[PDB]
Amino acid sequence: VISYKAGDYHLVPKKFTVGKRIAVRSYLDRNRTELSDRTFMPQKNWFRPYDLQDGCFDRDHERLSYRFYNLETKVIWKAFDTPELIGMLLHDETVKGNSGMYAPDMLDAALHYTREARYWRCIGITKPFYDRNTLRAHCWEDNGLQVGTLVMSQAMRHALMDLERAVRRKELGLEPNYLWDRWGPIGFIDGARADYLPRFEHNPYVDPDGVDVTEIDVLPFNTHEQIRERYRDFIEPDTAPFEEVFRSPSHGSLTTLADIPNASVVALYKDLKLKAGTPVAGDAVELAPADVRTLFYLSANPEWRAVADGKASWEEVVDAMQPVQAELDEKIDAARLLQNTRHNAERVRAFFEEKCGFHDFMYTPDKTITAAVLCYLTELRRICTETAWGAALAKCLTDMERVQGMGRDAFLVYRHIEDAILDKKRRLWAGRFAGESHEESTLDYLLENFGR
Amino acid sequence: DAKDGLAYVQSLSLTSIDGAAVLSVEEEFPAAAQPYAAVDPVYQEAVR
Amino acid sequence: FKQGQGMFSHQLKRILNKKSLHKYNWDPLHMYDPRKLVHANRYVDHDTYEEKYDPHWEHNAHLVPDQQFYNIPVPKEYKDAYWWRDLQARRVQCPTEWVHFRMHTKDKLKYDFQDLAFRKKFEYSYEDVVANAKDMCS
Amino acid sequence: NRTHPLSKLRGNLRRNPSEIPRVLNMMIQGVWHKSGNKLYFRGGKPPNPSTHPYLTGEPCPVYGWK
Amino acid sequence: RFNPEGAGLTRGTSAYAWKWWHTQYPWLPNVAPADYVPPSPRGIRPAAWDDEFADVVLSMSDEEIQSYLLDKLTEVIFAETQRDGYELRRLDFEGKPLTELPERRIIENFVFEEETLRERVLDRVVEGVFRLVPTSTDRLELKSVANIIDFVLTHVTVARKPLQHEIPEAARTVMRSHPLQPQLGFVHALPTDNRDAVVQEWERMHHLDWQFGKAVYEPRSAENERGNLTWLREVRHHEAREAFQADVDSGEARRRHMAKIKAAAQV
Amino acid sequence: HKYLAKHGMDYQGRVPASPAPGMYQGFSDVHKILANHPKPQRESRHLPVMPMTPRVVFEHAQ
Amino acid sequence: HAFMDIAIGSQPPHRVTFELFTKRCPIASENFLKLCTGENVLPQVSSIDGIGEPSFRDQFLPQLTYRNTTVHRVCKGYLVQGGDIVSGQGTGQLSIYGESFDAPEEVKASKFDRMGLLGTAVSAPHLNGSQFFILTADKAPHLNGTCICFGRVVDGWTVVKAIEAIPLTAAGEPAERVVVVECGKL
């Protein structure tokens, strides 16, 4: 038999119904007090599944016609808008499954544009691409038929005025205060109102030194060639002072009194530095020179090497009988190089703070920045092209496949450098939210104590 | 809806349908050279 | 203080009487797409995985008409969802205030009026009315 | 922008009953752009959209027209 | 008067929501980029997640993995993340942590925003436990327990090898020669509800699903046989076909058919 | 509200004018959600250019 | 003469030697050499002037060679069609002569009465592209004035009769991807 006591199946699940009858819900029963978690907690998202589109690339051209039309063309753009995140999408397109993102070709085009997109960013170009196909720095002064005479918009012939006015100044011998070298990622670093370029004829840039630049001046500087030599000195960034800082251990965050063993190894560094020739004990938490700090990381993670040289009862012996892992400090500095400048728009800007000494990235003029990127892509190529561990390391995304190829022990190392960097951030964040003084009482007393 | 029409309809051996006195059971074969364009919806929809 | 007494208000009261073009655009069967029913009731053959050519299908098929298509064929079972379009294609294609000549006079008889298809019936010519009424010797 | 039948380009010279109210307001009113200059119709003889030469191509910023 | 980037707006509509009243734009529903295709059970596995991990993970289904993820995330939070500074479980008289781990709500509203917290979860759960790797632009919205679960539950659903419809031969010749074949075109007769995804899904603001001649048609492979008229309506029609078929087997059909022509000849 | 959160302080300095490139990118008629300033820029580093709204062009015509 | 190597998914290439009727039908047959011989090459990179002045940029554009093409439409017992440089799905036609070409003498004078014959694949007589088809069903009377029979497979018929036996997946495509690895001349 099949028992049934009645008043059982309602014919509609008991949620969508009153005792009997489905109930009505019309966005007026609902409050706006739900949906107010949106101010912090973001709404649901549809993460697209990553595709190596080779299934869509049944044949050749459609695969090498989106290399440009979709991959390269996203670099010409990023080599124009923000050349610092030009290593971010190189990860974005290789996490998505693409093949030759860090190939010896994509970089040597990314660095090509990054180098030149500067000299047509100072020329006044606002969009790097004219149409789907060609670049706007190749619109010739005919319809398309002129040889090299660039179609100079009014913005340009006012960007080429500011350049010419900067030339005449240092041609007068004065200091060439080029306007767009106070121009950074936030606009004028000087906190001034941005001077917008199609400048009104009733707001002409006036320098009380008597420098004349007008339309009669810049009209002959039409084609690409006679500016790359005339304003060579300004459109070109300088790569000398940044030449090798990415190929060198620098940990802008990490302090001398900060190590994974917070005391044990630094007790050795104080022990070596009292029984020393030129001995100096450590109370000043002031940062030690960069290269000696990365030694302890190469001497604090592996309890192998923590004791392997802790036995050493002299100063330089520990400081210099470990050059064998100092031959390993680049293979880790190639890791702290990628994963630093990779993931978020913030990790990269915080990264350049350490290496190229940008106190604040947001105020360093573009001339100083495009260089550091140019000096950073110039050493991405070194890593990808010169040494064999560079390719796979680039195409590695997780740690599991990262540990395999390059030094398994070398990955033990910096994952206690990164874990030490981030734990310094732990000091700042949780540093704010640990002072508890609230109560019903002391929150009253904290008024009068605030009164004086 | 079979290829065995002519040989079947003669298996009966019709001789009358109450008035017929069937005169001849010839086979039409009007499927001769029927283009696939006669059954293909993708085509017939292009013509219609 | 009105405004615009000028000529543009003297044309726009005379040229706008011009009767625009009328095309009896009959209703679009959005939710019941009729042409995606050519694939209903089709034996998929397990070689080419396409519809086998059913010779019967076209006989249980009810050609629902259309404007951009001559006559879309749909199987018989799904014929009634298109009940409005078979009532709009048989219709006469003009607001019947224009063809009111047919509905009130004695053309009420000389015309097919099934679902507002004001189409003339058959009508002998005068060469035949006498050819058919003299041959009878009436 | 009247357009040639063959030309894939789309122009806004419609004559549907829903679109003539604005196609006259171009020929008799004209457009007063928010930049201060009066557009397509600025003077006396109202244009004849159906005797325009056909739309040849969309405008570009660098040159005039692609 | 609109404010795009308004932290309301449901984050799908910031252009379509200028229209719609103040009272109706907060509720406009999340639908899709209108080009995002469903999560697809395709076979593309992350570049380096590999087998052994895939063979294990693929064993877990997408409620067997959503469940694991919630436990791990409550474990990642209230772990290094919480024990490091704040506390996330209510304490008793003396101040002892009554419950072991946080309550399921505190986790739900928890927002992994500060980089220090996201990296503390993403290297452990989505990179460590799952060996997944998230892009930069998705790492932006990948900042909640709700979204961490979905991001996995798309990139693991796009991993199950698409079910391979492979049939043998010996059984294949059965379904061919078998008398009763399937019509198999009906899915198209189903009525279409194609329009803007928002106007189509705003109407399903509540259980407007089975209502007013609609039906969420999930393709059904087996049918209940009790009381099912359209099922008994043919199982007899079938048993009326096996009975008629009995004649043609023996030959009483040919006779009863040859008796017509001899009734229809002499007349 | 973005210095206070990331620095733990009041800014206590004159804020830069000319909004940073990349801010108010979905807005269309800012003009109020700003001073009468222009829509700042794209998120680029190209030299500042006035987005020639119908308004800016009129000022040129004055 | 000419060859073509056929790779049935995970199986090795196999030479298919075509004897092109270069005598009676010059255009469509010489269209085959230029397509098989790898005659149109345009290798370029964006950095070094690939993008700036030339504006050619036609190398992000259907490439006009049979290299790495597919064999898409395979009608068992009938033929094996394949070879397209524009769309993987079998649609669209490319040629030496632009989009397509019609040759009046070369279309009317065609007769498909041998097995192993090699013709063009048309959407209509006025349209002939890279798309060829190798006839497997012996006789083809309904194909007389439709397309051009510019040659026949001279040997290696094993594959065109081994391709034909490859199962169709749901998509009306061969279950396993038949790829044309590398072509040339003989």
Annotate F12-62 with three-state secondary structure.
Answer: CCCCCCCCCCCCCCCCCCCCCCCCCCCCCCCCCCCCCCCCCCHHHHHHHHC
Q: What's the rounded Cα separation, in Å, for the pair E159 and A66?
A: 25
Amino acid at A101: M
Q: What's the rounded Cα separation, in Å, for the pair A20 and A18?
A: 5
Q: What's the rounded Cα separation, in Å, for the pair E119 and A55?
A: 33
Q: What angle do CA D17, D22, D26 make, to 5 degrees?
A: 135
Joined together, the tokens standing for residue G155 give: 């040997």
All residues of chain C having their beta carbon less than 8 Å from the beta carbon of residue B1 are 55-56
Instruction: Judge whether E19 and E199 are in contact, CB under 8 Å.
Output: no
Q: What's the rounded Cα separation, in Å, for the pair D38 and D59?
A: 19
Question: Which chains pack against C, by 3+ Cβ pairs within 8 A?
Answer: B, D, E, G
Joined together, the tokens standing for residue G147 give: 């397309």
Q: What angle do CA C119, C120, C125 make, to 5 degrees?
A: 160
Q: What's the rounded Cα separation, in Å, for the pair B1 and C59?
A: 12
Instruction: Judge whether C61 and C37 are in contact, CB under 8 Å.
Output: no
Burial label for E148, CB within 10 Å (0-12, 13-18, 19+), is buried
Contacts of E33 (CB under 8 A, 6+ apart): A46, E12
**Which of E3, E5, E16, E18 is the mutation pick for testing F, counting most F CBs within 10 A?**
E5
Contacts of E117 (CB under 8 A, 6+ apart): A429, E81
Instruction: Judge whether E31 and E194 are in contact, CB under 8 Å.
Output: no
Tell me how crowded residue A210 is: count the other CB atoms within 10 A of its CB. 6
Residue G140 per-residue DSSP state: B
Nearest to C56 among B1, B45, B48 (CB): B1
Consecutive H or E run containing C75: strand C71-75
Distance between E191 CA and the closest CA of chain C, angstroms:
5
From the CA atom positions of chain D, what is the Rg in Å?
13
The structure tokens 């106070």 sit at: A182
Q: What's the rounded Cα separation, in Å, for the pair G3 and G154?
A: 9
Distance between C46 CA and the closest CA of chain G, angstroms:
10
- What crossing angle do the helices spanning E229-250 and E252-263 adopt, rounded to 10°? 80
Residue of C nearest to E172 (CA): C46
Nearest to E127 among A35, A38, A398 (CB): A398
Give start and end residues of each alpha helix (H) in chain C: 8-11, 85-89, 101-104, 126-134
Verify whether the Cβ–Cβ distance G45 to A109 is below 8 Å. Answer: yes
Joined together, the tokens standing for residue A97 give: 């499954």
Amino acid at E265: A
Q: What's the rounded Cα separation, in Å, for the pair A77 and A92?
A: 15
Element counts in chain G: helices (H) and strands (E): 3, 8
Q: What's chain C's length in residues?
A: 138
Question: Of chain C residues 26-45, which have a CB less than 8 A from chain E?
Answer: 30-33, 36-37, 39-44
Q: What angle do CA A203, A205, A209 make, to 5 degrees?
A: 135
Nearest to A167, CA basis, from A122, A100, A136: A122
**Distances, alpha carbon E235 to alpha carbons B38, B42, E180, in Å:** 36, 36, 13
Does F12 contact chain A (CB < 8 Å)? no
Q: What's the rounded Cα separation, in Å, for the pair E59 and G135?
A: 47
Contacts of F2 (CB under 8 A, 6+ apart): none
All residues of chain D having their beta carbon less than 8 Å from the beta carbon of residue A153 are 62
Instruction: Judge whether G13 and A75 are in contact, CB under 8 Å.
Output: no
**Which of F29, F58, F60, F62 is the mutation pick for testing D, counting most D CBs within 10 A?**
F58
Joined together, the tokens standing for residue A438 give: 């609230």
Amino acid at A232: R
Does D43 contact chain C (CB < 8 Å)? no
For residue A321, the SS3 value is coil
Q: What's chain E's length in residues?
A: 267
Contacts of F11 (CB under 8 A, 6+ apart): F3, F4
Beta bridge partners of A129: A135
Joined together, the tokens standing for residue C9 give: 């208000």
Q: What share of chain D is helix, strand, coil (3-state, %, to 5)?
A: 20, 5, 75
Amino acid at F49: V
**Distances, alpha carbon G95 to alpha carbons C34, G24, G29, G133, in Å:** 39, 19, 11, 15
Joined together, the tokens standing for residue A277 give: 């020739």
Tell me how crowded residue E16 is: count the other CB atoms within 10 A of its CB. 14
Amino acid at E145: V
Q: What's the rounded Cα separation, in Å, for the pair E131 and E112?
A: 19
**Distances, alpha carbon A68 to alpha carbons A57, A118, A239, F44, G25, in Å:** 14, 20, 28, 21, 39
Instruction: Judge whether A129 and A73 are in contact, CB under 8 Å.
Output: yes
Instruction: Judge whether A376 and A87 are in contact, CB under 8 Å.
Output: yes
Tell me how crowded residue A307 is: count the other CB atoms within 10 A of its CB. 10
For CA atoms E167, E170, E176, E179, the dihedral sign is negative
**Which of A53, A64, A67, A68 is the mutation pick for testing G, counting most G CBs within 10 A?**
A68
**Distances, alpha carbon A233 to alpha carbons A204, A218, A226, A365, in Å:** 24, 17, 13, 16
**Distances, alpha carbon E107 to alpha carbons A219, A434, E82, E83, E124, in Å:** 65, 21, 11, 14, 17
Measured between its terminal Cα atoms, the distance across chain E in Å is 92
Consecutive H or E run containing C63: strand C61-65
Residue A238 per-residue DSSP state: P
Verify whether the Cβ–Cβ distance B18 to E258 is below 8 Å. Answer: no
Q: What's the rounded Cα separation, in Å, for the pair A385 and A380?
A: 8
Question: Of chain G residues 57-76, which have a CB less than 8 A from chain C?
Answer: 76
All residues of chain F having their beta carbon less than 8 Å from the beta carbon of residue E14 are 26
Residue C71 per-residue DSSP state: E
Instruction: Judge whether D54 and D4 are in contact, CB under 8 Å.
Output: yes
**Distances, alpha carbon A274 to alpha carbons E149, E172, F37, in Å:** 54, 87, 62
Joined together, the tokens standing for residue F4 give: 């206070």
Instruction: Judge whether A59 and G69 are in contact, CB under 8 Å.
Output: yes
**Distances, alpha carbon A406 to alpha carbons A140, A250, A389, E110, in Å:** 50, 21, 6, 37
Contacts of D44 (CB under 8 A, 6+ apart): none
Verify whether the Cβ–Cβ distance B1 to C55 is below 8 Å. Answer: yes
For CA atoms A311, A315, A319, A322, the dihedral sign is negative
Distance between E215 CA and the closest CA of chain B, angstroms:
29
Joined together, the tokens standing for residue C3 give: 């405004």
Amino acid at G105: E
Pairing of strands G151-153, G117-120: antiparallel
> Do D and B count as touching (3 or more CB pairs closer than 8 A)?
no
Three-state SS for chain E is CCCCCCCCHHHCCCCCCCCCCCCCCCCCCCCCCCCCCCCCCCCCCCCCCCCCHHHHHHHCCCCCCHHHHHHHHHHHCCCHHHHCCCCCCCECCCCCECCCCCCHHHHHCCECCCHHHHHHHHHHHHHHHCCCCCCHHHHHHCCEHHHHHHHHHHHCCCCCCCCCCCCCCCCHHHHHHCCCCCCCCHHHCCCCCCCCHHHHHHHCCCCCCCCCCCCCCCCCCCCCCCCCHHHHHHHHHHHHHHHHHHHHHHCHHHHHHHHHHHHCCCC
Joined together, the tokens standing for residue E17 give: 């929501």
Distance between C48 CA and the closest CA of chain G, angstroms:
7
Consecutive H or E run containing G117: strand G117-120
Joined together, the tokens standing for residue A396 give: 């590695």
Instruction: Judge whether A448 and E145 are in contact, CB under 8 Å.
Output: no
Consecutive H or E run containing C74: strand C71-75
Does C45 contact chain G (CB < 8 Å)? no
The approach used to solve this structure was cryo-EM
Joined together, the tokens standing for residue C29 give: 């069967």
Distance between C44 CA and the closest CA of chain G, angstroms:
11
For residue C112, the SS3 value is strand
Instruction: Judge whether A159 and A123 are in contact, CB under 8 Å.
Output: yes
Distance between B42 CA and the closest CA of chain E, angstroms:
16
All residues of chain E having their beta carbon less than 8 Å from the beta carbon of residue B18 are 264-265, 267
Q: What's the rounded Cα separation, in Å, for the pair A245 and A358?
A: 12
Residue of F nearest to D61 (CA): F52
Tell me how crowded residue E139 is: count the other CB atoms within 10 A of its CB. 20
**Distances, alpha carbon A71 to alpha carbons A85, A135, A178, E134, in Å:** 14, 15, 35, 18
Contacts of A452 (CB under 8 A, 6+ apart): none
Beta bridge partners of G124: G127
Residue A48 per-residue DSSP state: P
Instruction: Judge whether A372 and A380 are in contact, CB under 8 Å.
Output: no
Joined together, the tokens standing for residue F28 give: 């269309």
**For the sheet containing G4-8, what is the strand order?**
G4-8, G178-183, G69-70
> Do F and E count as touching (3 or more CB pairs closer than 8 A)?
yes
Distance between A241 CA and the closest CA of chain F, angstroms:
22
Verify whether the Cβ–Cβ distance D62 to A151 is below 8 Å. Answer: yes
Contacts of A109 (CB under 8 A, 6+ apart): A72, A75, G45, G46, G47
Burial label for E2, CB within 10 Å (0-12, 13-18, 19+), is middle
Nearest to A411, CA basis, from A296, A298, A274, A275: A298
Residue of D nearest to C18 (CA): D17
CA A30 to chain CA centroid, Å, is: 43
Distance between G67 CA and the closest CA of chain A, angstroms:
8
Does A245 contact chain D (CB < 8 Å)? no
Instruction: Judge whether G2 and G15 are in contact, CB under 8 Å.
Output: no
Consecutive H or E run containing A168: helix A156-171
Q: What's the rounded Cα separation, in Å, for the pair E154 and E162?
A: 14
Joined together, the tokens standing for residue D62 give: 């660098």
Residue of F nearest to A154 (CA): F49
Distance between E5 CA and the closest CA of chain F, angstroms:
7
All residues of chain B having their beta carbon less than 8 Å from the beta carbon of residue C56 are 1
CA E171 to chain CA centroid, Å, is: 31
Does B3 contact chain C (CB < 8 Å)? no
Instruction: Judge whether G108 and G34 are in contact, CB under 8 Å.
Output: no
Tell me how crowded residue A189 is: count the other CB atoms within 10 A of its CB. 18
Nearest to A93, CA basis, from A111, A74, A78, A76: A74
Experimental structure resolution, Å:
3.6
Burial label for A87, CB within 10 Å (0-12, 13-18, 19+), is buried
Q: What's the rounded Cα separation, in Å, for the pair E259 and E59?
A: 66
Backbone angles phi, psi at A432, to 5 degrees: -70, -40
Joined together, the tokens standing for residue E265 give: 């000849």
Tell me how crowded residue A328 is: count the other CB atoms within 10 A of its CB. 17
Question: C98-125 burial by CB neighbour count: b if 16+ within 10 A, else e?
Answer: eeeebeeeeeeeebeeeebebeeeeeee
Q: What's the rounded Cα separation, in Å, for the pair C118 and A272?
A: 112
Does B45 contact chain C (CB < 8 Å)? yes
DSSP secondary structure string, A175-195? ----GGGSEEBTEETTSPPP-
All residues of chain C having their beta carbon less than 8 Å from the beta carbon of residue D28 are 8, 12
Burial label for A312, CB within 10 Å (0-12, 13-18, 19+), is middle
All residues of chain E having their beta carbon less than 8 Å from the beta carbon of residue A48 are 36, 154
Consecutive H or E run containing G108: helix G104-108
Verify whether the Cβ–Cβ distance F47 to A82 is below 8 Å. Answer: no
Largest CA distance in chain B: 47
**Number of alpha carbons in the 13 Å side-chain half-sphere of residue A5:** 1
**Which of D60, D63, D65 is the mutation pick for testing A, counting most A CBs within 10 A?**
D63
Does D44 contact chain C (CB < 8 Å)? no
Q: What's the rounded Cα separation, in Å, for the pair A447 and A437?
A: 13
Nearest to G83, CA basis, from G31, G139, G39: G31
Q: What's the rounded Cα separation, in Å, for the pair A231 and A219?
A: 14
> Do A and C count as touching (3 or more CB pairs closer than 8 A)?
no
The structure tokens 């009645």 sit at: A6
Q: What's the rounded Cα separation, in Å, for the pair A186 and A361?
A: 10
Residue of E nearest to C34 (CA): E189
Residue of B nearest to C63 (CA): B48
